[PDB]
Structure formats: structure tokens, C-alpha cells
From a paper:
Mutations in leucine-rich repeat kinase 2 (LRRK2) are one of the most common drivers of the familial form of Parkinson’s disease (PD) (1–3) and are also associated with increased risk for the sporadic form of PD. LRRK2 is a large, 2527-residue multidomain protein. Its N-terminal half is composed of armadillo (ARM), ankyrin (ANK), and leucine-rich (LRR) repeat domains, while its C-terminal half contains two catalytic domains, a guanosine triphosphatase (GTPase) (Ras of complex or ROC) and a Ser/Thr kinase, as well as two architectural domains, a C-terminal of ROC (COR) between the GTPase and the kinase and a WD40 domain at the end. We present cryo-EM structures of LRRK2RCKW, WT, and carrying the PD-linked mutations G2019S and I2020T, bound to the LRRK2-specific type I inhibitor MLi-2 or the broad-spectrum type II inhibitor GZD-824.
As with MLi-2, the three structures—WT, G2019S, and I2020T—were very similar. Although all three structures assumed a DYG “out”, αC “out” conformation with a broken R-spine and a disordered activation loop, the WT cryo-EM map showed a closer distance between K1906 and E1920. In all three cases, the G-loop was folded over the inhibitor to interact with its pyrazolopyridine and Y2018 from the DYG motif. Although LRRK2RCKW(I2020T):GZD-824 appeared to also show a single rotamer, this cryo-EM map was of lower resolution and more anisotropic, making it difficult to establish this side chain conformation unambiguously. The G-loop adopted slightly different conformations in our LRRK2RCKW(WT):GZD-824 and LRRK2RCKW(G2019S):GZD-824 structures and this could, in principle, have an effect on H1998, which is close to the G-loop in its “up” rotamer. However, our model of LRRK2RCKW(I2020T):GZD-824 was very similar to the one of G2019S, yet the corresponding cryo-EM map appeared to show density for a single H1998 rotamer, equivalent to that in WT. The caveat, which we noted earlier, is that the cryo-EM map for I2020T was of lower resolution and more anisotropic than those for WT and G2019S, so it is not possible at this point to rule out the possibility that the conformation of the G-loop was responsible for the difference between WT and G2019S mutant. While our structures of LRRK2RCKW:MLi-2 showed the kinase in a fully closed/active-like state, as would be expected from a type I inhibitor, the kinase in LRRK2(I2020T):MLi-2 was only partially closed, with its αC “out” and a disordered activation loop. We did not see this difference between LRRK2(I2020T):GZD-824 and LRRK2RCKW(I2020T):GZD-824; the kinases in the two structures, in an inactive/open conformation, were almost identical.
Author numbering:
A (entry chain A): 1334 to 1342, 1345 to 1353, 1372 to 1378, 1388 to 1395, 1414 to 1419, 1428 to 1435, 1445 to 1456, 1459 to 1471, ...
B (entry chain B): 49 to 59, 74 to 154
The structure:
């Protein structure tokens, strides 16, 4: 198959028999709108080869003259008939000779093009096997055949073809797709493109030669669609009332600001002219600069190439004819000085700012034009910044402060960069200081510590966890801002990250720079590629060395960096191969703007279908009591290598765990309290050296080491720490407090405890000192909660106490012997019932997987934070261990700095946002 | 966010509180068998659930009040209903 198109002025379908159709010549698809050129100026915009054919010249020598007018194209044929031409066979033979001189997708397209008016992939999977490439098979595959056409948002799930694109003659998803395509095809504009072809009569502005700037663009040929594209793009023009007149633009905002962008041709001229007429004042020159910038962007992006001449018209005195001078000469004059002097009688002169107010960077923003006196701008070689790795940048001083100077050798690049920069004011974007007019340069603020690339390469020791988070957060902020303004960064690299302050609490740490490969998305752009590049950058921030030293491997395993949960997940989802599955940069920043992202040191998932009821921490390692069966299993989880082991040691479920320490002989014995009431003492060095203490009457529910044993009958048995190693040891004394009322809480700080609904205290003499009844607090929470067992006790100045299956935590003063609602905190920011407490701040682990955080002064909620919590406690870098359930057991190791650091970020972001509020 | 019927159950028939506990739930929770029987005879929702998915049977069998379990079962209750964690009153 092949595509053939009829081009030129005009038989049109009359000569096609020798809008889309099919015709064999080998079968081709013909479109009337190789390429066949029917014969005198419309062929230049069309120029894949074109074949010249006469327009049925049957109306001799005149035909030869007309052919030689343009020819003197691949060949010429005299098909001089509307039908049954003598040379029609010759033309067919020539076309055949010229034409002669994703296969699975092509085969499947026949079934694909069966839509009477997304699901096509299903048709590609029901009746095909290779199409299972899916991601690797549909990167570009249909638009190349003109059937089932698909940054156009309505293209992924969208698939009338070209005849309706019908609007020129005079489903909701289909209508939206048609509107989007018409906007893309430049048939209709979001202000029509075929409005009129005659220039309307214009109003009368100031006509003084000294008052206007005239820029002429001499172009030999008008590219097709040039005027419509220019009309579309000559709309985002601002001097900071657009009385716009449209024709195949009179954009006038004020009597001193207007662009007369028109086209014309003189009688004695065979080429075309594009004229820009602006007022020569402070405001109009900005409009002239913007118009020139837009025209140059149009002729560089849309229509590369095109010999185009640029002239500026100047008059020494009013009332004289305008004299046209090439812009290269004016640029040379502006480089040499600031006056253009008449070669004949050099006494009359005009400043460049009055003639070409875009070569001297004139009318740049008021706070930005460089003052030549204040700045040093000493661009001496070898006085570089970054040893020249940042381009042609050296050091200087603007107003007593060090700055970076970039010399521009060629005015197009400087103006383009300035226009890009003048609308990028963000705390994470390097901000513009000096325009740099006369040396033709650009001066920026200076980062003392070099770029982040240098830091990651060599200075790795000073890069802590909070510094990494701050750098990544600031860069994500910058990328999100760039995409907010529909601006696409090319490739975000560590080299583009400048570090100003290494103080982790500073508002701004990292900035993005672009000083005029491996950090590339699979598809290459689009913002999805930018999110991919940011994922790579965060991979190289979390892994300090990473890929800059030398589908990606897991960062915490390939390089052995400290684990960072909730960042590796972000890297994984950003580096997704499907561009539709990568999160947006806003979402990436929101993921980074997480209180729990920094503090969450470790997250360990235990074997499936395991139940752990209690744990203790050695002082790293953890002992756990498995309760998924009726046998007493003791597990040993190493927090470093995640080496979860387990074994059966008891005949009944292990309910509590404690760790007796004996510095006298350097011993450490874990005591396990089981359901049957057996205290199993095992030396933590080896599991063989084990025995049992005196068996309790009932279940052992709590153990504390000062060794205190709490049973299910309230019989607190006191064991000396040195007699824990004694086999069958009997307690020196037993309080025997309560009844057949479990004693389940024991805390230090005279030390206190809780059994049933009573709180007890006792001193080193080991008898009841204070007894408090906790069922008197039934007017604050109903009896369904107060009358439950007491499961947790903590103490700083008042006893914070938590009861079984109760979302309410009570506070009891230690002196007068007399209220936190977890459901309230959860609802404001899901089971609620309190399962554990811990103290440092107050941490409340509820049954639904939440971990409420409170201060110890006003009980204020900080953060609510696997969907269960079984037990949380401290360990040691002081950290917090939390155990919960999914049943898939869950261990979560946070940094105990969690109450403070998450506050800092809450202020941090805020003050950083303040900077944006000041930058606008 | 509770009604005097809630407090009577502790010490509308299906109105729920912050915890999702309707009078019934609290009656089967504290252990007032007579109150549970009165509530079912008054038109209670023996298939209701709290914010944690528990049913009146769940709380009845969760504390060993098997008489309340029988009273619920005889009054159209479902013995195989599941909670948020999937457990049934038979499991508890
Ligand atoms: C001297 C100098 C001039 C210019 C720039 C600059 O980048 N400008 C700039 C221009 C454009 C853009 C945005 N476009 C949009 C899309 N484009 C496709 C991509 C980007 C950016 C934005 F940033 F927004 F991306 C920055 C930086 C320095 C500098 C410096 C410096 C400062 N401190 C230092 N210390 N050691 C060394 C060192 C060096």
C-alpha cells in the first residue's frame, strides 16, 4: 500500500480518474487536496516528490511556454484532455515508476476500522497473540493510513475522518473530539481562519517618522498556513484594551502601544513584506519585542528555515523617505556604541533605542536593566563559576553581593532566555538580577556551595536525611511550578540543582538552573517524561551516589543506603513505563509533602497468616509472641537484616514478654508469660539455657523489669532480678491485689500499675500505697468502656491510662486521685478503640491502624497517621516500634523525632510558600 | 451525639452514635439481656453494624453473654454476618 496526494492549484478530481478514495496503479490511497502537481506559485509552499502535469491543455507553444515559465518537480507530462488523453498512459507509467522507486498492526487495521460511528485493544487481544506486546506494540500505531485517527488529550480513548473538518461550508464525546481537532488543525481558533482576504481600512495613528518603529520582513514565498498560525499566536501579547482587527493583526492597546502586523507587496517587488509598525515610546517597544519574539518563534518552531530579510526603517529628519537598514548593521552599531551617525556629514545621529529597540535589550522590566556602574561584570577567563561546567559563567559583584555572569556571544538566544525567565518567579527557580545589555550578558544570584551534583559526587557526609528531603521537596516544587505554567523542562538533572544553604531548616536550599541522556523517559516532550526525570533525580538523592557515579534496581538494596519507605514507592510509581500511570508533578510533591515520609525509618511485613500479640526490644532486635495457634511460639525479628525466625517454646499462647538485665554478671533473660500461667525464662544469648519460675495460678498478662509478674488474678509477684536465673524461683512477696481482675499494667515513676478497674501504687517496700477506683469516671464515658479491663499505663506527671476495647484514654492525677477521645480525632482528620499507648509526647495506637500523636501540655493533635495497631513502644537513635495486623502482621519503625520534625515541615513549607506569595 | 436510649442501654431504636453503637449494641455490650430482648421485641435491627462492622450478636458473643446470643438468634438475626475484619459472632 501507498499514499498518493493531488497537489497544486486545476482539474482536481477530473484528472484523478486517470476527499479520500482507493485506486490501484499495487493499490494506493488517493487524497485530492508520490505527489502529483497539476499545473504557478502554489507549488512552492507544497515543497515527497512532485510531478508536473498539464491542466488538460486542450483549449501547443503556449503550453510549452507555460511549462518552461516554472520548470526552467520531477518530470513534465502533457496530459491535454479531460478524458482519454494521449499522454494519460505515459503519465500512469511515470507515476508507477516513481511509486515503485507494524505489519501485524496493518493486518489488524482492517478489523480495527469497523466502528459505525478504547475497546479496540480488546479486539486486538481476542483475535491476536503477538499484540500482547501492548505497551511495546502501540507506541505509535492508524494515523499513518488516514483511518481511525488517534498534546491532544482526546486521543488515548478516541478513534468524520477529514471531510467534516464541513464547518467551512457554513455524540458529546464525538463533538468534544471534533472541537479539539478543529483547534489542533487550525480550522477554528479559540479567540475561524477563513475570515477574509482583504485588509480592512485601519485607523490613523501617529505618522511621524521619529515616533514610529517600522520592522520589515522580506520573504520570497509565503509558507502555507503562515497567516493563520501568526493570527493564533499573536494573541498572548501584553504591555504589562486589545481593539483587535483580524485579516489574513491591528493589535492596539493604547495610543502609545500598538502593533500593526500586516502583509503587503510593492508594485515594483516580486516578494512579500510583513510590516510591524509600533510607537517609539516606553510601552510600544515592549510590544515590538514581543511581536518580533513571536514571529521568530513561529519561523523557528513551526516553519524551520526560511532568504528571509529583516529591515528596520529610520529617518534622520521628519518628512523624508524612510531608509531601510539591515538588522545586522544595526546590531553591529549597537555593539560598537549607542548612536547611528550619517556617513555623509557625520553631524546628525540617532540612538539605537529610537530605531531598533530590541537590539540593546531596551524596555526590559524596570527592576532588571543592568546598571553598568554598580556591577563588576569582570568576565575574566579562569575566574569561572564551576570551572566552566555551568557554561560561560564567571563570578562578579552587583551591589556588594557576589553574583554569576553569563556572557552571550547571537542576540536571539539572549532575548529568548530573558523572555522565558521574566515570567518564572518561584522560590525554587533561580531568579533574574541583571539584564546584561552592553556586554550582552545575564547576571544571576550565586550559590555558594556549588551545584547538588558536586555535593552528591564528593560531599556525601554532610547530606543528612532531612537535607535530602528538603532538596527533593524544593525541586519537586520547582517542577510542579514549571508544569503549572505549561512549561516543559528538558531533562531535570543533578547538575541543574544549585545548593545555597546546607542548614536543614532554611526556607530555600535547592534551586533549578538551565545554562542553555541518561535522565530520559522511555518514550523520549511531555510532563510525564518530566515526572520520570524527577523520579530518577529522587532516586539519585535518596541513593546519594546512585547512577551519577556508576528498570532500575531497588535503591535500598543495590547501594545499601538507609531504608526510606514512602519514597521508594514514589520512585517506583514515577518511573512507571506507562506515561498514563505516572503521577502528576503536583501529586508527586504532595507525596513528598508528607509528615510521615521523613520519620518512617523501617516497615517490615511478617509471613502471611501470623498473629503476634506482644513484643519486647533488646538493648537491635525484637522478640515477639506469636498467637495464631494454641502453641506458644517465640519469634525473633532482627531489625537490621529482617531475619524473622520463630520456634515453639511453650504449650500455651504467649501473652507477655519482658527482659531482665543483670549487669553484675552481664546476663539478659527474656521472661515469657503464657496463658497456662508458666513463666518461661530463656537466656537471650542462647535458647537452650531455659527454665521456668514458680507457676502462677492463672494466666500471666504483664511483665515489667526493675522482675514484676502480673497474673490474671491480680497476684503481682515480685522477683529479684538476680533470682530470675534461679530455676523454679519463688517470689519474695506477692501483693495479691484484686480477685479472679487481671493485673495488666506496670510502669515506673515508687512505681504504679493497673488491674481490672483499679490503679495501685507501691514503693520499694512492696505494699499498696495508693489505690484509686477508675469506675468513678462513668459520667465522662459510659459503662461499656470504663468497666473494661485496664491495658496501658504511662506517667510523666499524671497517669495516662487506657482500657480494653475503649477509644477513650483517661488521665488521673497522681495526688488527688482523679480524657482523650480518639474517635473525635479520627473523625476531624477506622475502629477508634485504643489498643496501645506510649510516652516520650503521647502516642495512641488504635485498632484501625491509626497512630494519634498528642503533646504533653495541651493534648493537642499533631498527626493521626496496615489497618490495625497491636502494640507500640520505644526502642534504641531513639525510635518507636508499632505492631499491627492486615492476617498479615505489620511492624513500623518511626523516628522518635516524629512529633517535632513534622511540626517543622508544617512551618517550613508555609514560610517557603510565603516566598512565592512575595514572588507572584 | 447519643440519645437517652443509648444511656439506658449502657446502664430511635437504630440511631447511631460516634462509634456506630445503637442502643442494641450497647445493650448487648454491657450485658443487659432484658434490654436486648425488649429492643428486639420493639423492632430492632439485629443485622445492623457499627463503624467497625460489628453486629449486636458480635458484642453479645464477644463478652460471653450467650443468653443474648440466643435471644438475638430467635429474632431473625444472622449468625454468619461479618465485621470489618471479616470475623463472625461464631468466631468471637
Ligand atoms: C548565570 C545563569 C544564567 C541563567 C541561568 C538559568 O538557568 N536561566 C533559566 C532559564 C529558563 C528556565 C526554564 N526553562 C524553561 C524550559 N526550558 C526548556 C527549560 C528551562 C530556567 C529554569 F530554572 F526555570 F528551569 C532557568 C542560570 C544561571 C546560573 C547560575 C549559578 C548560580 N550559583 C552557582 N554556584 N555554583 C555555580 C552556580 C551557577
Amino acid at each position: 500500500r501507498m499514499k498518493l496526494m493531488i497537489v497544486g492549484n486545476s482539474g482536481k478530481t477530473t484528472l484523478l480518474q486517470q476527499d479520500v478514495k482507493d485506486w490501484p496503479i499495487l493499490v494506493l490511497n488517493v487524497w485530492d487536496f508520490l505527489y502529483l502537481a497539476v499545473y504557478v506559485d502554489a507549488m512552492k509552499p507544497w515543497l515527497s516528490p512532485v510531478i508536473l502535469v498539464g491542466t488538460h491543455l486542450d483549449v501547443e507553444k503556449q503550453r510549452k511556454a507555460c511549462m518552461s515559465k516554472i520548470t526552467k518537480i520531477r518530470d513534465y507530462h502533457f496530459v491535454n484532455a479531460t478524458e482519454e488523453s494521449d499522454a494519460l498512459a505515459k503519465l500512469r507509467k511515470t507515476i508507477i515508476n516513481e511509486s515503485l522507486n507494524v505489519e501485524l498492526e496493518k493486518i489488524i487495521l482492517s478489523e480495527r476500522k469497523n466502528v459505525p460511528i478504547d475497546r479496540k485493544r480488546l479486539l486486538q487481544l481476542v483475535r491476536e497473540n503477538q499484540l500482547q506486546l501492548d505497551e511495546n506494540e502501540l507506541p505509535h500505531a492508524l494515523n499513518e493510513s488516514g483511518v481511525l485517527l488517534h498534546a491532544l488529550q482526546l486521543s488515548d480513548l478516541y478513534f468524520w475522518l477529514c471531510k467534516i473538518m464541513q464547518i467551512l461550508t457554513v455524540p458529546k464525546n464525538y463533538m468534544s473530539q471534533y472541537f479539539k481537532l478543529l483547534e489542533k488543525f487550525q480550522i477554528a481558533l479559540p479567540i475561524p481562519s477563513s475570515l477574509s482576504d482583504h485588509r480592512p481600512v485601519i485607523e490613523l495613528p501617529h505618522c511621524e517618522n521619529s515616533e514610529i518603529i517600522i520592522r520589515l520582513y522580506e520573504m520570497p514565498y509565503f509558507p502555507m498556513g503562515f497567516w493563520s498560525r501568526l493570527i493564533n499566536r499573536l494573541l498572548e501579547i501584553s504591555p504589562y484594551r486589545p481593539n483587535r482587527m483580524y485579516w489574513r493583526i491591528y493589535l492596539n492597546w493604547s495610543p502609545e502601544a500598538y502593533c500593526l502586523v500586516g502583509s503587503e507587496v510593492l508594485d515594483n517587488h516580486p516578494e512579500s513584506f510583513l510590516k510591524i509598525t509600533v510607537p517609539s515610546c516606553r510601552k510600544g517597544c515592549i510590544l515590538l519585542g514581543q511581536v518580533v519574539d513571536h514571529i521568530d518563534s513561529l519561523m523557528e518552531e513551526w516553519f524551520p528555515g526560511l532568504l528571509l530579510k529583516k529591515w528596520a526603517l529610520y529617518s534622520f529628519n521628519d518628512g523624508e523617505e524612510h531608509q531601510k537598514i539591515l538588522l545586522d548593521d544595526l546590531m553591529k552599531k549597537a555593539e560598537e556604541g549607542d548612536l547611528l551617525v550619517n556617513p555623509d556629514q557625520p553631524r546628525l545621529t540617532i540612538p539605537i533605542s529610537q530605531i531598533a529597540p530590541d537590539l540593546i535589550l531596551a524596555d526590559l522590566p524596570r527592576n532588571i536593566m543592568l546598571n553598568n556602574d554598580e556591577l563588576e561584570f569582570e568576565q575574566a577567563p579562569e575566574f569561572l563559576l564551576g570551572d566552566g561546567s555551568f557554561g560561560s559563567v564567571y563570578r562578579a559583584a552587583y551591589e556588594g553581593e557576589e553574583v554569576a555572569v553569563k556572557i552571550f556571544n547571537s542576540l536571539r538566544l539572549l532575548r529568548q532566555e530573558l523572555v522565558v525567565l521574566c515570567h518564572l518567579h518561584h522560590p525554587s527557580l533561580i531568579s533574574l538580577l541583571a539584564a546584561g545589555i552592553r556586554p550582552r550578558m545575564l547576571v544571576m544570584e550565586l550559590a555558594s556551595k556549588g551545584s547538588l551534583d558536586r555535593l552528591l559526587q564528593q560531599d556525601k557526609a554532610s547530606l543528612t536525611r532531612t537535607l535530602q528531603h528538603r532538596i527533593a521537596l524544593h525541586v519537586a516544587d520547582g517542577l510542579r511550578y514549571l508544569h503549572s505554567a505549561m512549561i516543559i523542562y528538558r531533562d531535570l538533572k543533578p547538575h541543574n540543582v544549585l545548593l545555597f544553604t546546607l542548614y536543614p531548616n532554611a526556607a530555600i536550599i535547592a534551586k533549578i538552573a538551565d545554562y542553555g541522556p541518561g535522565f530520559r523517559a522511555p518514550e523520549v516532550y511531555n510532563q510525564q517524561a518530566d515526572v520520570y526525570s524527577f523520579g530518577l533525580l529522587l532516586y539519585d538523592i535518596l541513593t546519594t551516589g546512585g547512577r551519577i557515579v556508576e528498570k532500575l534496581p531497588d535503591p535500598v538494596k543495590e547501594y545499601g543506603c538507609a531504608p526510606w519507605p514512602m519514597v521508594e514507592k514514589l520512585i517506583k510509581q514515577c518511573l512507571k513505563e506507562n506515561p498514563q500511570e505516572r503521577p502528576t508533578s503536583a501529586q508527586v510533591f504532595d507525596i513528598l509533602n508528607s509528615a510521615e515520609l521523613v520519620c518512617l525509618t523501617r516497615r517490615i511485613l511478617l509471613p502471611k497468616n501470623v498473629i503476634v500479640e506482644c513484643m519486647v526490644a533488646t538493648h537491635a532486635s525484637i522478640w515477639l509472641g506469636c498467637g495464631h495457634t494454641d502453641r506458644g511460639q517465640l519469634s525473633f525479628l532482627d531489625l537490621n537484616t529482617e531475619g524473622y525466625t520463630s520456634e515453639e517454646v511453650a504449650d500455651s499462647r504467649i501473652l507477655c514478654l519482658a527482659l531482665v538485665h543483670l549487669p553484675v554478671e552481664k546476663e539478659s533473660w527474656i521472661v515469657s508469660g503464657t496463658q497456662s500461667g508458666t513463666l518461661l525464662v530463656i537466656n537471650t544469648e542462647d535458647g537452650k539455657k531455659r527454665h521456668t519460675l514458680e507457676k502462677m495460678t492463672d494466666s500471666v498478662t504483664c511483665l515489667y523489669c526493675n522482675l514484676l509478674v502480673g497474673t490474671a488474678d491480680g497476684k503481682l509477684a515480685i522477683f529479684e532480678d538476680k533470682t530470675v536465673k534461679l530455676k523454679g524461683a519463688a517470689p519474695l512477696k506477692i501483693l495479691n491485689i484484686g480477685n479472679v481482675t487481671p493485673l495488666m499494667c506496670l510502669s515506673e515513676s515508687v512505681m504504679w500499675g493497673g488491674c481490672g478497674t483499679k490503679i495501685f501504687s507501691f514503693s520499694n517496700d512492696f505494699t499498696i500505697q495508693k489505690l484509686i477506683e477508675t469506675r468513678t469516671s462513668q459520667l465522662f464515658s459510659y459503662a461499656a468502656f470504663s468497666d473494661s479491663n485496664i491495658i496501658t499505663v504511662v506517667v510523666d506527671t499524671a497517669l495516662y491510662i487506657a482500657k480494653q476495647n475503649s477509644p477513650v484514654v483517661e488521665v488521673w492525677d497522681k495526688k488527688t486521685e482523679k480524657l482523650i477521645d480518639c474517635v473525635h480525632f479520627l473523625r476531624e482528620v477506622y475502629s477508634g478503640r485504643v489498643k496501645t499507648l506510649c510516652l516520650q509526647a503521647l502516642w495512641i495506637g488504635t485498632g484501625g491502624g491509626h497512630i494519634l500523636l498528642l503533646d504533653l501540655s495541651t493534648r493537642r493533635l499533631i498527626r493521626v497517621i496496615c489497618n490495625s495497631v497491636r502494640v507500640m513502644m520505644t526502642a534504641q537513635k531513639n525510635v518507636m516500634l508499632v505492631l499491627g495486623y492486615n492476617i498479615q502482621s505489620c511492624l513500623t519503625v518511626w523516628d522518635i523525632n516524629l512529633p517535632h520534625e513534622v511540626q517543622n515541615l508544617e512551618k517550613h513549607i508555609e514560610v517557603r510558600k510565603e516566598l512565592a506569595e512575595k514572588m507572584r | 451525639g447519643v440519645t437517652p436510649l443509648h444511656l439506658a442501654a449502657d446502664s430511635d431504636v437504630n440511631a447511631w452514635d460516634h462509634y456506630g453503637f445503637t442502643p442494641l449494641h450497647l445493650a448487648a455490650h454491657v450485658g443487659h439481656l432484658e434490654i436486648v430482648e425488649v429492643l428486639l421485641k420493639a423492632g430492632a435491627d439485629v443485622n445492623a453494624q457499627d463503624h467497625a462492622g460489628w453486629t449486636p450478636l458480635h458484642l453479645a458473643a464477644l463478652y460471653g453473654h450467650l443468653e443474648i446470643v440466643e435471644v438475638l438468634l430467635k429474632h431473625g438475626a444472622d449468625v454468619n454476618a461479618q465485621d470489618m475484619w471479616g470475623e463472625t459472632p461464631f468466631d468471637l
